From Swiss-Prot, chain A:
Located on the platform of the 30S subunit, it bridges several disparate RNA helices of the 16S rRNA. Forms part of the Shine-Dalgarno cleft in the 70S ribosome. The gene is rpsK. GO terms for biological process: translation. This is Small ribosomal subunit protein uS11. GO terms for cellular component: ribonucleoprotein complex; ribosome. The chain holds residues 20 to 122 of 128 of the full protein.
Amino acid sequence: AHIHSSFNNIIISLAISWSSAGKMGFRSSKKNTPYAAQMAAQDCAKVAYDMGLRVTVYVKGPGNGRESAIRTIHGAGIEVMEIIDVTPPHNGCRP
Amino acid sequence: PNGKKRKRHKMATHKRKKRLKKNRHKK
RNA sequence: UGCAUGGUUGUCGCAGCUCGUGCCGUGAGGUGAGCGCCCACAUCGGUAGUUAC
RNA sequence: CGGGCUUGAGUUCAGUGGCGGCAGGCGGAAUUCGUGGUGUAGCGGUGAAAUGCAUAGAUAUCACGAGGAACUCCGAUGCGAAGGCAGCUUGCCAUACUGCGACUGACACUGAAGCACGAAGGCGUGGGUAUCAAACAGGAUUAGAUACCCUGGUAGUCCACGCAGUAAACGAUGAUUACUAGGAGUUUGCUCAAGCUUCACAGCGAAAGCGUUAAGUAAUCCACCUGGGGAGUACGCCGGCAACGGUGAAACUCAAAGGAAUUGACGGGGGCCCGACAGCGGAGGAACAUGUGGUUUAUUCGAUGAUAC
Ligand SMILES: [K+]
Ligand SMILES: [K+]
């Protein structure tokens, strides 16, 4: 269960299935909102629970809705076994 | 530290640096 | 001739307007007393009675 | 001129250092590309969008292979003549501070010419080339946008050697020596001495302010200034592949140009408070009444953003 977030969008991939705020319907000034992340999490969890697999979290980016997505994924079907942060730059490339 | 003192010096540097570019590649 | 005036008027639209001491500054400057009600409408209680009741 | 002295200066020894210089090795995170698993309706970006990538198979995600650049936390302090110096380790250098009962005996300071070093950007030859990114291209906003915002993108940014010699190269404060009050911290060597920064006596200053790291008191040498433009321009000369650097006028023109502080006014600078920002009925459309403006003929005169009509 990998949640890739940013300042503009939040997407979720389980592996098998994936979801995103843009796929759910939110376009601008709403993809980085608690509602859209939970909606995308529910959209992915509808197939996650109906898959025979019941997981660890790999949240990567900083954004508003990671908690909502994790809570929705735990509530629907399987439960979040462990939320291990994988947020990753020891003075690397110039931005 | 009035500020207008440096504006005249900045402005004449612009005229000097622009005047040389008009004939740089112009043989 | 209201761009010569008096007296009146409208706006600013208003909460801060003055009188003295000391002290600070080379200077331009800073910082104890005077001032911010009335009229009408409601209830009740004493006197008046016509061209009023 | 001829001798002496050790306090200045230097040499030796011991202790204590250090993002000081040069050179050789070693590293993990992130990130780029190529090749393969999973998987499919979008991703990205913005104030909102679009240009862009993507079902002849994206974003995401798991691997293998090939590379380039920068060194998170420590981390604010320390070093260097300055410019500057920060992953780990080693080698070779330089240098500083403190002391000795070791040495020599004024061997010192400064320094026009000259020489050396000297950020970034730039130039030449050979490598390399991931990110970012002048110029350039497209998309937006605007009356226009040759900009600010977004997407691409070549020099350059990296390495070696050689040019170039500039900066708000600033503490806008040259070097050396001696002396003169207190508070608050900090580092190292041990209450003491070096260094490191802000309040602050005397004094200085036009004031802001400086004040043992002076802009205080004094002495030595060097650099520079003599109102503002013209102008760091023109000519000549020297240097450089070029870019350009150095030296550096006059004619003419003006009565100013400036510094520090004070009171207002203003701010698409902030703060603190107190009232304009849910309902109802009109005007703006029609016909008349009325008052003005305009034109006409004599259409008396005045009132003309809010505050005339
Ligand atoms: K002071
Ligand atoms: K060249």
